[PDB]
């Protein structure tokens, strides 16, 4: 047993390792999306910038969980980072919809993690999740919802003009 370990259940340790993988996966999805918009036949530079920033944020989320694992005396175990589900993301609207779906999936995982921490009476872990993850997720989901709504109302994906103008005035 680690000399620092206290009130840290083996199930919580394993769930933290699973969350690390999921955050890295989310980073990869956003990386793929970003460079799709950098294609010469797509060419929406602020969509590209927005998703690259989201990708880098997800990496920060993963690294903080790795730090947490060590803080509590757990041991990090890494797994393959699966490639994203799509190579071609179709449109700005479709990418935003996939991002919304991704963020809700990551949120569900975080909520399950919190439920586990609650069941194991781990208030430090509960606080960690609430303070650093849960509101960030709520804000990210709300922002993506707002973006999807605007793109739909503007006439995307059929209107290339709508995506162009959204790229300039919301993401730029």
Q: Which residue numbers belong to the known binding site?
A: 23, 58, 61, 103, 137
Distance separating alpha carbons of residues 131 and 115, to the nearest angstrom? 15
Q: Which is nearer to its own copies, 63 or 90 (CB)?
A: 63
Residues 47 and 107: beta-carbon distance below 8 Å: no
| Residue from 77, 85, 88, 119 in contact with Cl ion (CB under 5 A) | 77
- Residue 21 beta carbon to Mg ion: minimum distance, rounded to whole angstroms: 5
Residue 36's φ and ψ, nearest 5 degrees, are -55, -45
| Residue from 12, 30, 61, 96 in contact with Fe ion (CB under 5 A) | 61
Output the known binding site for Fe cation: 23, 58, 61, 103, 137
Binding residues vs Fe ion (CB under 5 A): 23, 57-58, 61, 103, 140
């Amino acid at each position: 047993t680690s000399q620092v370990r206290q009130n840290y259940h083996q199930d919580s340790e394993a769930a933290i390792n699973r969350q690390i993988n999921l955050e890295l996966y989310a980073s990869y999805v956003y990386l793929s999306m970003s460079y799709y918009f950098d294609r010469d036949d797509v060419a929406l530079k602020n969509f590209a910038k927005y998703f690259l920033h989201q990708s880098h944020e997800e990496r920060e989320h993963a690294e903080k969980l790795m730090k947490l694992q060590n803080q509590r005396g757990g041991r990090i175990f890494l797994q393959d980072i699966k490639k994203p589900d799509c190579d071609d993301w179709e449109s700005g609207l479709n990418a935003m919809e996939c991002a919304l779906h991704l963020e809700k999936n990551v949120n569900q995982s975080l909520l399950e993690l919190h439920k586990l921490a609650t069941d194991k009476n781990d208030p430090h872990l509960c606080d960690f999740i609430e303070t650093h993850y849960l509101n960030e997720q709520v804000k990210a989901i709300k922002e993506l919802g707002d973006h999807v709504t605007n793109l739909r109302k503007m006439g995307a994906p059929e209107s290339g003009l709508a995506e162009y103008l959204f790229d300039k005035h919301t993401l730029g």
